[PDB]
Amino acid sequence: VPVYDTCTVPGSFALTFDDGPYGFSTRLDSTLNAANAKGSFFINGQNWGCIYDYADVLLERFNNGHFIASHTWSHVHMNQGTYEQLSHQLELVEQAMIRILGVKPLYMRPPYGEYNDVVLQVLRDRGYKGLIMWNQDSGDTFTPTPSSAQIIDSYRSFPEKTISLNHEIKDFTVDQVIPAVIPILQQKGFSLQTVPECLGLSSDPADWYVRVQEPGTRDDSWTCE
Ligand SMILES: CC(C)(C)OC(=O)NCCC(=O)NCc1ccc(C(=O)NO)cc1
Ligand SMILES: [Zn+2]
Secondary structure (H helix, E strand, O other), X not given: OOEEOOOOOOOEEEEEEEOOOOOXXXXXXXXXXXXXXXXXXEEOOEOOOEHHXXXXXXXXXXXXXXXXXXXXXXXXXXXXXXXXXXXXXXXXXXXXXXXXXXXXXXXXXXXXXXXXXXHHHXXXXXXXXXXXXXXXXXXXXXXXXXXXXXXXXXXXXXXXXXEEEEEOOOHHHHHHHHHHHHHHHHXXXXXXXXXXXXXXXXXXXXXXXXXXXXXXOOOOOOOOO
16 A cells, blocks of 8 residues: 655645544644645544544544545554554444444544554555545644644745644644644645645545445434443
8 A cells, every 4th residue: 555745746735633523623624724724634433532422523524525545443553563463443434434424434544654564555455545644744742742823834844745743632733833724825825635635636525535435313222442
């Protein structure tokens, strides 16, 4: 399975967000949508909330041209897992997306940026088309953590074709950094694209997923317990 860390489209720039959705996600998506900016979201199943509790955010995201991909169910260190454990960690996110959205993801980003040959083999066997890394880190999960002002200033020098790592579980990323950096990036000529678009893969959202069935209605299976 191909590994990607840099966009190819001239002028493109990918704002990407891990570990969500979260309690600030409707604000984040409103900010992106107001600027016609597209985000790439690498979601968990049970990590900072249960994916089924975020079904409405997920449906908005899915229907507004944002890219949704897997970050594993439990945010595991994938190099420590057996083939079977990793398959289960991916399957569980696939199943949530099937129930909520009717589709399976075709892409994923490994927690901690950690992957090996077992990970790549599982992704191949499960039909994934790519493993998505990044090439600039906002620093929003560094510890000690840089200030929002510092992170915004770093964004002023991230070049074209950046795939930037952010975490939407950080309130200041949603409320301070992204509202400041969207105009910085758009006004200097960058196109805020999803990762598949910026890789010269498809710009059609339907090409980022595999349709399985019609979206389900919430029932007692929509649980992480
Ligand atoms: C147990 C918990 C989960 C609390 O934290 C950790 O152990 N962190 C280990 C940090 C690390 O090794 N490298 C830097 C890094 C890059 C990307 C990601 C990631 O997954 N972004 O979404 C995480 C870390
Ligand atoms: Zn993560």
